[PDB]
């Protein structure tokens with residue numbers, strides 16, 4: 001479904017970021033679009049890439065030069081650990097910094113509220129409020145619950161992304 | 166060349182482990198042997214792999230694939246005094262595994278560039294390396310940022326297989 005709408009001749013660049021241990025690597029792997037490749041453009045800055053035909057997913061941790069990899073980004077996936085209540089405030093701050101980058105002003109926002117399987121995970125209502133998504137103007141956004149370990153939620157989120165480019 | 170020595174017909178499997186943040190991914194990237202590929206064979210277990218001709222490096226974090234292993238590289242953060250005991254415990258666990266009794270051991274005392282780093286004698290001591298019998302081992306200081314020490318360590322590894 002989403003695969004159909006994303007594939008083509010023109011490069012499709014997706015940025016997936018979030019705090020460490022949000023589940024970003026696990027998501028890449030569960031997509032099955034090919035090998036996860038790690039590069040280190042500078043020491044301490046680990047970048048994971050999955051490239052399949054015209055589609056690129058670029059992943060790194062935030063909250064710890066970036067502007068280079070923002071070129072022609074069409075979507076931001078922001079992954080959050082729904083169970084990490086102590087760092088939701090940090091996640092909000094890193095998301096808002098991303099959303100103030102002019103280079104990516106026309107990128108749509110998909111938020112995965114990940115680790116939905118966990119007994120004290122925040123609800124999608126809670127994650128949406130605490131990330132301040134309602135405050136977003138002139139950008140399409142969606143927040144989608146996910147479990148990156150069984151893959152629940154991932155295709156639903158990507159389907160929305162593909163439909164709204 | 167440490168590379169030319171490892172090269173040949175016979176498979177050469179190296180296992181590189183250590184605590185998270187020890188410097189293992191950085192070391193792999195510095196080796197320039199090929200793309201680093203991540204797999205997740207089981208939930209929560211991230212494995213990085215570099216394969217070049219007959220040589221494969223397999224990397225994962227311990228703390229917090231043993232068949233035909235010719236060498237173990239253990240990477241320790243020389244500047245992390247609070248966790249070196251944990252590094253010792255995980256190293257000793259691995260060296261007790263039957264499947265790998267025949268593997269030689271290279272220890273990289275990494276992050277040697279940092280001004281407060283433990284000296285090699287102290288790393289050696291706090292890892293209990295001297296207590297290891299019936300295994301060839303070597304401790305080498307390294308800096309993964311600029312490659313200091315890496316070639317020296319790998320050359321010892323290639324020589325002593």
Ligand SMILES: Nc1nc2c(ncn2[C@@H]2O[C@H](COP(=O)(O)OP(=O)(O)O)[C@@H](O)[C@H]2O)c(=O)[nH]1
Nearest residue numbers: 020021022023024025026115147148149208209
């Ligand atoms: N329970 C649960 N654990 C998850 C989920 N997604 C990721 N994890 C675990 O959280 C840890 C961090 O995952 P990882 O993908 O490496 O996060 P990254 O640092 O953002 O790339 C790993 O142990 C994962 O197995 C999830 O949806 N549910």
Ligand SMILES: Nc1nc2c(ncn2[C@@H]2O[C@H](COP(=O)(O)OP(=O)(O)O)[C@@H](O)[C@H]2O)c(=O)[nH]1
Nearest residue numbers: 043044185186187188189190191276308309310
């Ligand atoms: N100062 C210094 N920092 C290092 C060295 N090796 C790695 N690092 C840093 O330590 C952090 C963790 O290294 P990484 O390769 O990701 O460790 P891994 O978790 O064992 O794969 C990164 O911020 C690196 O920049 C080193 O030799 N010296």
Ligand SMILES: [Mg+2]
Nearest residue numbers: 021024025026
């Ligand atoms: Mg990751």
Ligand SMILES: [Mg+2]
Nearest residue numbers: 186189190191
């Ligand atoms: Mg690593």
